[PDB]
Design a binder for this molecule. Structure first.
Ligand SMILES: *[C@@H]1O[C@H](CO)[C@@H](O[C@@H]2O[C@H](CO)[C@@H](O[C@@H]3O[C@H](CO)[C@@H](O)[C@H](O)[C@@H]3O)[C@H](O)[C@H]2NC(C)=O)[C@H](O)[C@H]1NC(C)=O
Ligand SMILES: *[C@@H]1O[C@H](CO)[C@@H](O[C@@H]2O[C@H](CO)[C@@H](O[C@@H]3O[C@H](CO)[C@@H](O)[C@H](O)[C@@H]3O)[C@H](O)[C@H]2NC(C)=O)[C@H](O)[C@H]1NC(C)=O
Ligand SMILES: *[C@@H]1O[C@H](CO)[C@@H](O)[C@H](O)[C@H]1NC(C)=O
Lengths: 35, 35
C-alpha cells in the first residue's frame, strides 16, 4: 500500500539483533548432530 | 494495591518479537517439555 517503498538484498531486521542467539543455537545443534 | 484493575493476560508485542523463531519451537517443545 505504501508508495516509494524500496528493495535491495535487505535482510529482515529480525535476525541480526538475535544473531548471537539463533546462530549459536544452530551451530550447537549442528555440532551435536555431527557425530 | 492498584484500584480498578481487571484480570486478563498482558498485551503488548515483545513475546512474538524476539521469540519469532522460538514460539514455533515452544509449540514443538509443548509435546516434549510438558509431558
Ligand atoms: C520488493 O520486494 C518484494 C520481495 O522480494 C517483492 O515481492 C514480490 O512480489 C512479486 C509479485 O507480487 C512476486 O512474484 C514476482 O513477480 C515479478 C513480476 O512477475 C517477477 O519479476 C519476480 O521474479 C517474481 O516472480 C515475488 O514472489 C515477491 N517476492 C517474494 C520474495 O515473495 C515486491 O514486488 C518488490 N517490489 C518492487 C517494487 O520491486
Ligand atoms: C483475577 O485475579 C483475582 C485475584 O487473584 C481474582 O480474584 C479472586 O478473589 C479474591 C481477590 O479478589 C481472591 O482471594 C484471595 O486470593 C489469594 C490468592 O491470591 C488467596 O490466598 C485467598 O483465597 C484470598 O482470599 C481469590 O482467590 C481470587 N480468585 C482466584 C481464582 O484467584 C479474580 O477472580 C481473577 N479473575 C479471573 C477471571 O480469573
Ligand atoms: C464508579 O462509580 C459508581 C458510583 O456509585 C460506583 O458504584 C462504582 O463502584 C465506581 N467504579 C469503581 C471501579 O469503583
Amino acid at each position: 500500500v505504501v508508495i516509494g517503498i524500496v528493495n535491495n538484498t535487505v535482510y529482515d531486521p529480525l535476525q541480526p539483533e538475535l544473531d548471537s542467539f539463533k546462530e549459536e543455537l544452530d551451530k550447537y545443534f549442528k555440532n551435536h548432530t555431527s557425530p
